[PDB]
Amino acid sequence: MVMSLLGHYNNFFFAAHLLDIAMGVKTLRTILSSVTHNGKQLVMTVGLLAVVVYLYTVVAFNFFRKFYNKSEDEDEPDMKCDDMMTCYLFHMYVGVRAGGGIGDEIEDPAGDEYELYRVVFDITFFFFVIVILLAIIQGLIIDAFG
Amino acid sequence: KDMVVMLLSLLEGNVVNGMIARQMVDMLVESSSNVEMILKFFDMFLKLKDIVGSEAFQDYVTDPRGLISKKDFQKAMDSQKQFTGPEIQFLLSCSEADENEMINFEEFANRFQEPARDIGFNVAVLLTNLSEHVPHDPRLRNFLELAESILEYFRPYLGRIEIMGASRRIERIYFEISETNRAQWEMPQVKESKRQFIFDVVNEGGEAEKMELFVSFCEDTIFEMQIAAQISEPFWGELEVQRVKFLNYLSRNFYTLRFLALFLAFAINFILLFYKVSDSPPNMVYYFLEESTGYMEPALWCLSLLHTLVAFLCIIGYNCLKVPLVIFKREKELARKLEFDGLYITEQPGDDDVKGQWDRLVLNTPSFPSNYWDKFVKRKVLDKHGDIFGRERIAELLGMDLASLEITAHNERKPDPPPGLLTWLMSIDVKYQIWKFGVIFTDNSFLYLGWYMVMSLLGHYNNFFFAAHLLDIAMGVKTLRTILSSVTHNGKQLVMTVGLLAVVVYLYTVVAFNFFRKFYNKSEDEDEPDMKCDDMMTCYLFHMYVGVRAGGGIGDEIEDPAGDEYELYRVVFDITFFFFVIVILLAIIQGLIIDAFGELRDQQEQVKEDMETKCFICGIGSDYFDTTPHGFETHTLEEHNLANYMFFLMYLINKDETEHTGQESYVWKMYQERCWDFFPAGDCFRKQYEDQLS
Amino acid sequence: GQWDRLVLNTPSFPSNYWDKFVKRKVLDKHGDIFGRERIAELLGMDLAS
Amino acid sequence: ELRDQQEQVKEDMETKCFICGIGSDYFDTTPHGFETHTLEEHNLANYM
Ligand SMILES: Nc1ncnc2c1ncn2[C@@H]1O[C@H](COP(=O)(O)OP(=O)(O)OP(=O)(O)O)[C@@H](O)[C@H]1O
Ligand SMILES: Nc1ncnc2c1ncn2[C@@H]1O[C@H](COP(=O)(O)OP(=O)(O)OP(=O)(O)O)[C@@H](O)[C@H]1O
Ligand SMILES: [Ca+2]
Ligand SMILES: [Zn+2]
Ligand SMILES: [Zn+2]
């Protein structure tokens, strides 16, 4: 009702009624139950992912700040890790969505005194965040199916 | 009560429809009037105790002094519609009304609650025994109905178990459960310990060790109940009493302190989110908080100090709440290994068992069984092994003076126990304390709390070290703990696959270094190339760093092989790398994680199914008991309840050996000999008397 | 349970439930032990009618 | 599949006698009955 009434205020509010198939069609209802069955687990893994990304943000802010320049310009750099909140947002936004982890986005560590530390940083981020945690989420979904 | 105890003894080893039980029923029927008078004496006062506490009675209570007139008592009791005229008159007579006909009902109700409790309980036990062994006698149902209130009142304390007796038959045993015992068994921490124990045995246990593991669990539970009772709460003396109060307060609130430390860590990290680095002070850089409130700069310091304090209190609470159980378990297993195995007398572990090798330090200490109840384990080991190995050698191993045994047997000395710290200084057993501290420092939970300490302390060196305490949710939240267990379950497999991935990447590195070097130029410049595969170590690092993280394998990063004499070889290289490394191996890792999820789920399901389908004690499945309606529920709640075996063990320990009955003495002797054949194994009372009962 | 307290003393509590005499039955069962008038006040009954 | 194969092998050994084929349920009528049957009566090492 409320969404229908708001649809007269703005016609795009009628897009919400398209979600009605979630309950109208029993197959879609079962499929979404295969998600909602382990919802508490999914939210807990999302929170744990947030915490591990926070830890990586802390390490980056302390040590690897010089690698977070996201400006091709030379005289006005765009540093994404001069503030801890900005660095954490940068991580949670681009590092998780990047296929190869944060190392895909940040600068190349070749020929630097911290090269090995940074490659360990990138590999561990890729394995814990991109591989293991997303694998946990997908496994929770598949296990709910089973 | 003594007469009833004699009757119950007459019912020892009594089969269903036994002649002695039938004679007992005939005797009760012959004295039906007097038995009814006795049961009425009990039920009137049981009913009165609750009636005087009812709102309906308190409505009639009007005197500000808390008393009631006899006429008001009369009109209150007939309003309850539970007594008759003569019964109300008898209650009036029993009430010690003064010259003003004023009744002190509070003391009137409690006058007979205590004196009549034991006899009421034994009457309940007698009637229950007769009912369950003579189930087809109509004359006994009348007594059972007339004692309905007695049986109802004593139902929570009437503990019954079944044992395989000396007569090679199943016997049913009735005993008393105390209010304290039941209340302590219903505590949430004890429930959690029971759940963990059930999970452990049902999941990864064998049937031969099951009853022994259960009895060990019962013993640990008894010790935990003692610790809970101790820590419970209703100039040297003042300092000692305040110290024990403080320690008990910490022990009781250990989990609240843990939660508080976690909350403080969250607050500290939230504050830390506002940090900012600038070249200007608030070629070195400067770290500072960037805010307009001006308050979280001191708030961070306050929270850090509070967090360190709370973590310290958590460690103290732990070694005042759990370390006693750890030491108890270790001392108990050591004592049983000494006595029933001769571990350090006969086998002498072969230096590959660090536990056994560390336990050597506590053998000769004067205070070895500090937490274990058996203070005479050394004496028992001596009496068992001194003849065959040497009394003096055993005494030297266990640090015993063979001379003092006689005088201790002769008489008891009462010296002066001076309450001085100076006199207490050399009372300390240094070797025992070293052993205990080794056991504590080798414990996982204590080590975790000590690491929490170290990180908190380092947090004052640098405030970002408080980020590590955010990992505490891994153990604080059971859901996150299970989720991380779904990773750690196959950790060895995961590490092996990572190593195998390293090896295959090394092979690809070897092939690339030998043949495809020209394709590894990572410089857009033309005059100073950046070759990543002119050195084997550089090439291997390049692979393990960019090839694995690339979605399409190494071919995404290296140069295009179009129009080259090695084009086909290189495309085979790239495709095989993509399939073996990116697809198959990462798929193996994710499959290991998903399989750990499934394994944990089926473990939980199997534990629940085993509990709901077989009796934990006898092993007979629910199918047999469900022949009678609610048969399995009754068998698991009344006949073979494991809580009742726990209660029976505590009842035996607390009861005097001279007062043990025959069945109790049988079980007690067998328990002290560590023989568990009294547990019904595959047999039950219902099964043994199938034909009489049916 | 806390929301169901509003319907106890209503004149029309068993509107859909078939048993229109549940209040009478509860009175006959518990009035002796808890108080007939107190039960009637809880369930909104007139003991006179 | 590999995991359930291992579990099935362990379960079969722990539930039926490798020689006679009578399950553990029958022998467990006597206490420790299956353990005694598989260690003394029908031990395969003893047939070897
Ligand atoms: N010998 C046994 N003693 C007790 N329970 C047994 C036994 N054998 C099997 N069970 C099963 O153990 C299950 C767990 O006990 P139950 O759930 O009744 O206990 P509870 O104290 O009410 O609470 P909880 O659900 O926390 O265990 C019961 O459903 C029962 O079927
Ligand atoms: N006929 C049988 N002979 C021997 N074992 C049998 C037989 N039938 C079933 N089993 C089972 O085989 C299992 C494997 O044997 P068991 O583990 O006892 O042998 P082991 O020599 O002590 O060591 P291991 O664990 O390496 O096998 C036993 O637990 C037993 O229940
Ligand atoms: Ca005696
Ligand atoms: Zn049973
Ligand atoms: Zn066999």
From Swiss-Prot, chain C:
- Tissue specificity remark: Detected in skeletal muscle (at protein level). Fast- or slow-twitch skeletal muscle.
Q: Where in the cell is it found?
A: Sarcoplasmic reticulum membrane
Q: Which domain of life is it from?
A: Eukaryota
Task: Kindly list the positions annotated as binding caffeine.
Answer: 18
Q: How is it modified after translation?
A: The N-terminus is blocked.
Q: What is known of its domains?
A: The calcium release channel activity resides in the C-terminal region while the remaining part of the protein constitutes the 'foot' structure spanning the junctional gap between the sarcoplasmic reticulum (SR) and the T-tubule. Pore opening is mediated via the cytoplasmic calcium-binding domains that mediate a small rotation of the channel-forming transmembrane regions that then leads to channel opening.
Q: What does this protein do?
A: Cytosolic calcium-activated calcium channel that mediates the release of Ca(2+) from the sarcoplasmic reticulum into the cytosol and thereby plays a key role in triggering muscle contraction following depolarization of T-tubules. Repeated very high-level exercise increases the open probability of the channel and leads to Ca(2+) leaking into the cytoplasm. Can also mediate the release of Ca(2+) from intracellular stores in neurons, and may thereby promote prolonged Ca(2+) signaling in the brain. Required for normal embryonic development of muscle fibers and skeletal muscle.
Additional remarks? Binding of [3H]ryanodine indicates that the heterozygous channel is activated by Ca(2+) concentrations 4-fold lower than normal. Single-cell analysis of cotransfected cells shows a significantly increased resting cytoplasmic Ca(2+) level and a significantly reduced luminal Ca(2+) level.
Q: How does it assemble?
A: Homotetramer. Can also form heterotetramers with RYR2. Identified in a complex composed of RYR1, PDE4D, PKA, FKBP1A and protein phosphatase 1 (PP1). Repeated very high-level exercise decreases interaction with PDE4D and protein phosphatase 1 (PP1). Interacts with CALM; CALM with bound calcium inhibits the RYR1 channel activity. Interacts with S100A1. Interacts with FKBP1A; this stabilizes the closed conformation of the channel. Interacts with CACNA1S; interaction with CACNA1S is important for activation of the RYR1 channel. Interacts with CACNB1.
Q: Which family does it belong to?
A: Belongs to the ryanodine receptor (TC 1.A.3.1) family. RYR1 subfamily.
Q: What is this protein called?
A: Ryanodine receptor 1
